[PDB]
Every structure is written in structure tokens, then in C-alpha cells.
Amino acid sequence: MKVRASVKKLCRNCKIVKRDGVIRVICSAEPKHKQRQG
């Protein structure tokens, strides 16, 4: 998980998701893309 203030899709399998009022993107392709709006 990488905590950034500008979270976005980086590769094509990355998915935006909103959990508990927090925007994350999750990646079934590479765990490096797992990142969090904070």
C-alpha cells in the first residue's frame, strides 16, 4: 500500500474502490499498485 494524495489507476487491471469514505485502488495484477487516498 502506497499512501498518496492523488490516487489513480496506473495499469489496466487497477480498480477504483471507495471504502469507509476512503478512495483506494486495488490491483489484481501487481500488488505494487495497491494505493490509498491519504
- 5: contact with RNA by CB under 7 A: yes
Considering only 15, 16, 17, 34, the residue that binds RNA (CB under 7 A) is 34
3-state secondary structure 4-21: ECCCCCCCCCEEEEEECC
Compute the distance between CA of residue 33 and CA of residue 1 in angstroms, rounded to an integer. Answer: 7
Task: Write down the least CB distance from residue 18 to Zn ion, Å.
Answer: 18
Grid cell, residue 11, equals 495499469
Task: Write down the least CB distance from residue 16 to RNA, Å.
Answer: 11
- 19: contact with RNA by CB under 7 A: no
